[PDB]
Symmetry: none
Subunit: 228 residues, 8 copies
């Protein structure tokens, strides 16, 4: 019944605003979105399992291929992982892609690495989600086994880039330059979008500010909007 994914409704850092999320999900149908991509933080650090449960219940109404990645504050990891697992059981079109992958009709190989991707230091998943660069790279190296697929990466950490963020991660930029994904979604306020090498890097907007975007994969065109 579903067709190739061209339009992708997306946003980031909802930080627990379930009302805005409901509106976001509510818009989906009339925009013609083929799928949804959401970047954390889904919740503030203090949230607990039941909060994610509600968060995912709301998101499940979309009934569209949906992919997400957690944010630096979505800790401990297992609460997000458990509620993600629970909703995905009967809503298989939904998919947490943190450290893993999935295929969208196209075909498109979707994969991601959420949380804070730090230059170095030790990994953390309880007081926060922090991953040193070598860990992020190890997660994506699995993709080299899959052949001839255009990629879509979801990250929270922004790649270094002069016309997007010169404070961004060189390590994330390295990940993008290595895999050459067709699209890279990252967390950020103010819908923006630049080309980084052959990769279209989009900051869909921050939903905790009511922002979101609808991307045209084929034309690499970006249509923005707000929920307020």
């Amino acid at each position: 019944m579903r067709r190739t994914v061209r339009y992708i409704l997306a946003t980031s850092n909802p930080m627990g605003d379930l009302e805005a999320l409901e509106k976001f999900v509510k818009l989906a149908p009339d925009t013609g979105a083929d799928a949804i991509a959401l970047i954390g933080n889904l919740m503030p650090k203090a949230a607990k399992s039941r909060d994610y449960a509600a968060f995912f219940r709301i998101l499940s109404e979309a009934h569209l291929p949906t992919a997400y990645v957690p944010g630096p504050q979505d800790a401990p990891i297992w609460e997000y992982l458990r509620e993600a697992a629970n909703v995905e059981l009967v809503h298989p079109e939904m998919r947490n892609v943190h450290e893993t992958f999935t295929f969208w009709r196209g075909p498109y190989l979707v994969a991601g690495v959420g949380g804070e991707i730090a230059d170095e230091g030790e990994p953390e998943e309880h007081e926060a989600l922090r991953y040193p660069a070598w860990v992020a790279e190890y997660r994506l190296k699995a993709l080299w086994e899959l052949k001839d697929y255009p990629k879509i990466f979801l990250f929270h950490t922004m790649p270094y880039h002069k016309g997007l963020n010169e404070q961004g991660s060189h390590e994330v930029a390295h990940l993008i330059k290595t895999h050459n994904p067709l699209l890279v979604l990252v967390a950020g306020k103010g819908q923006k979008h630049e080309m980084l090498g052959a990769s279209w890097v989009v900051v869909p907007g921050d939903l905790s500010e009511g922002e979101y975007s609808l991307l045209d994969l084929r034309a690499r065109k970006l249509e923005t909007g707000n929920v307020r």
Copy 2:
């Protein structure tokens, strides 16, 4: 998007209850109809299935159904289902196959008796060893990104609530994680089996039917008698 499902099982030839069942659809707010066999008693003939399907078609709503253990030989149920479906696109037998409902929802089923082992039977009755039921549903793995709705005649095993149920059917549910599972049986009820919502819509030959609220995983019970 399908939310309310008017549902029932085991009509067993009672065409009067069927019409009353159908006549309900509008008042219930039903978005769709699901029906599990036995559609007809074993002795039934093709002409019987034709009349059955004609009344069902009057609902003019997305309708899905699987045969029961005595809807044999299989070909008679199939041909008449083929005939009514040529005319009403919203009508659909999902035994060993599938279709889509507004949402979308992947609706699929395996009717007849799903027995633990033994040989398959489709003439004297409809019986399928567990390996055949599993072989049919494995095709759904080609369409893994859709919430599913299963229609079975045979109930699954459920510890502390239904020790008579089939462990094999339970395994198919645990494996595919359907959002909703409809099974044949007398007396409206439902329980959560793992992450799947298993409902017994009621037995129509007893005037029983249910109206499910797929969103709240709840149901309104009713009777045509």
Copy 3:
């Protein structure tokens, strides 16, 4: 690891000839074939389950996407089905597509209806496999729910075609003209092929006679061979 399918190694009616089948499989690596399509009769009517089990074991050594449908003599239906189910549990790249379907990388929607597709009459699955045309059509009806996929069909029964067989089945030709599959493979001795509407209809050859063909899907061209 697998790439898109462009070259299909195909044949028909091996009729239990295990030596031929084996040699046929052994050709895959030398040719670069990306997939195998085999039409029945796989075994003579007299064959039993342990015969099918031996057939599938040899076929499983290909380690290639493989599709098949049975012939009029592959009865009773349950023995062929049980043994296909057995080998397919651990070699999921293999698939009996009789009455069902599967996707190959391309993508291609592979579906089939084996056995003898008769004009009318009664279905038979025990003394032989025979299905009235309305059944075969009923089986393929499910595919209409699947959107925009180029299709590949396997039938044992030849469709009516002024060039391939003026005595072929008119009903089968109707399924073809209706679904407009990209490719249609059918049982028959002597490799040959023609266009039926916008569908490439191919008779890969009869392995019992040692015949096979390597199909260049994009070109609608065929290379012929014989295992001797």
Copy 4:
């Protein structure tokens, strides 16, 4: 290398016995192995990163496609992961498959879930590696994206097996029945194997006891050995 992996040299639980590891690697050439599968614990809980580096350095000397998963004592998880990442940069045919996958000649999809797979409870990766069943099921569900490959699974926890291992895990048995891997390797002492449904389940032996096995994937039989 052979076209299809057939002979696999395997063992489990070396528990820091590096002399035994060196002898295991030393004899690999003589066995004609096409690949190596090793199940943890690779090291005792008290071992540190430098210990894993030594372990991997010795293992990499076999110069063969090698897959491994950690045991319940290989904690914290990041030390094993880090040293696995490191050696894999230098020897790309070496591969930790814990929570992920790789392909072996065939092609075979090799995947695993190391650590202790417990019925329920909380996940642990610092004092030990313990994953309740819902987490192991979540890791493997990603394989449905790559459903057309015969599979080889690596687990530390053994599945429940009526008559053979009444103490085994029902959840691990369920994962095997769900995914139908062709070969399942598990940790344990005393080389042995049995069929669990369609799956060939092998306990290759405990290296800290000097044991190892050379599997014949074709015949589904094994040749036992000891380095002592």
Copy 5:
């Protein structure tokens, strides 16, 4: 794909004619080509970057392993090179082989030296692409590191061939005699081919004039065509 490349769709000097190029590409699938070889000029000297981008975009739709070298007019070198690099990040099967190499299924070592190969003089890459013979020889000597592969060379400049093209370059003939490539593709109008010693030297045709050839590597015979 076939395991060994046998049919090569080839042409030269399209000179910016995007229309003929589109027909060349649209026509490829029907030829049953295993690969495509294109010799410049790809564009007239006046064309700029954007022109090379459009050229590559169209060529990339053939979805076949494709090798190419620039002509005397594809200057300045860096625009052709930059656009070649950009499109190859997206379509790995595309490869500029000017001064470098790549492998085609076989394996065949594909290499070339585009531009005008002059007997002497100074090298030029801005006003035009001209390379004195010592440079071409220098580029190709790297191939002695990859000694065990049959070679396919791409040159704009034609070699001297006693009695057929006595205006041809003796230096280029010397390169061919030294490396013994199995196949040599060169620019020129009017499809033709001859054996220069053991090497099959082919002038596939000038596309600005709608000409192209489909080579049969095995028979060392070619099929001619025109996009007229």
Copy 6:
């Protein structure tokens, strides 16, 4: 593109049987062989230049490192030599190693002395190929200049060995004892092998009788087959 040599497809004395040679060549992709080693007689004495050309054309289809030496009947020497020279110009992965050498990835220093190595007498290259031991030794002494390479020798003449052939040559045995090659391939019927000091001596089989072997270099083990 080529990896280290581990498996070698081998055979001897095909005696002009092109159908067998072709089946032999087609075995390579299915077995995964990394190289091919072939011992004469390639052709019966009666054969002339054009026959060797057909033989080499068929062998050239393998596209794999290949080494061969002539047998006592491959005379006059210059016919075998010219045709080897011809095919090796454009398929440089093939190599007649008679009185010379080549390197395979591993590395392995491959060399040979074909023809009949007689204890004494006069050399002959026209009515037959026969060389007295001192000539064979003189050819092999050139290798001492090449340092630290495991050696692979190809001879037609079998060495004296109580296990392999009690009537074999003591001189050849002596050359093997002096050079200490890793592998020695010799002509003979009935696949078999033995150790001669630290050297693995293999009789790969007689292709005229349809026999061949796939040697596993690392294991000094052979797998047997026949092309019937």
Copy 7:
């Protein structure tokens, strides 16, 4: 004669100091070096062809495998190249690896990108040698075609590295990160070394300051020295 490369004599920036070059060369035998690697600038910008001729003549007296790359000042590029081409004709052990590669006994795949590697900008090779990062990256990608080789990279531009330089190039670091070379040699004063990922990055010293290093490839350690 030559054996596997283990000890490398290296230095950088001789800047035309021929006397120091002679001393550097005269030291080779005393150091027991197996090879020499030299990074530019070979000459200051003012130098001309006859100057490179004198330089290469002195370097050739080493009689050892030797690799080099030009510096930012070795312009115009064609003079350096031409004199490299000249000396390399009869001294093939010598090799300018700028944009290409060679193999050293080991084996080690030796490659380089000399000159100034800048983040972006236009390529320059006449007034100076300057290459934007996308060019450096494009040169090295050809290497992915060569399998399982440990790599040795020669660069003039230093990679960003919290230890040896925070002003280093992030792009050069990216190249090292993607290829994981075994050894990376870079220009710089003061002999020093650090590990970057799995790569040993060495600053061998500045020859114009009398500095040089003797690397021990296997131990990843080096001895320092000065010629004045």
Copy 8:
């Protein structure tokens, strides 16, 4: 020490008297090695004749390379006596169709006999090899490509300077392999540059001629024993 000075000559044609003088000049000449091109003996010469030749040459006790001339047939007699002297003196080496290394290292290889444009090979009535055979011999050197090479041929390459009637095929072998030095047979000591290769005609010893080459400077020092 690394080979720098090479004492060379060609075509002694059985003149053992001249050969002995040639050999005895080696010491005061400071030669590091010796290279000798055929014909070593007239065609009528037999095995014991070659044995005498090699005995005198072996007295030099310096790395020595040689190839045979068109008249050194049948090939087997030259070969056997070369094998015999070489078993005893490791520095002696026939490089016809093969190779050896001199201190440097330098890869020394050669193809003696007459290198003819085409035709059939001959090794009994005389030594003649069509160009394709010479080329097939030398291609083995691509397996040892990182060494500077020293080539020995009896046949001279084509060159406007040295010889207008020279072989274009031999010239092509030189252009392909880029040998550092190439010694060929001929009368009158001389040398020219063929591309980057230094081609040297050391002289015809049956006329007393010989040369002492300085490889590093690419210069000749001529001399005569008569």
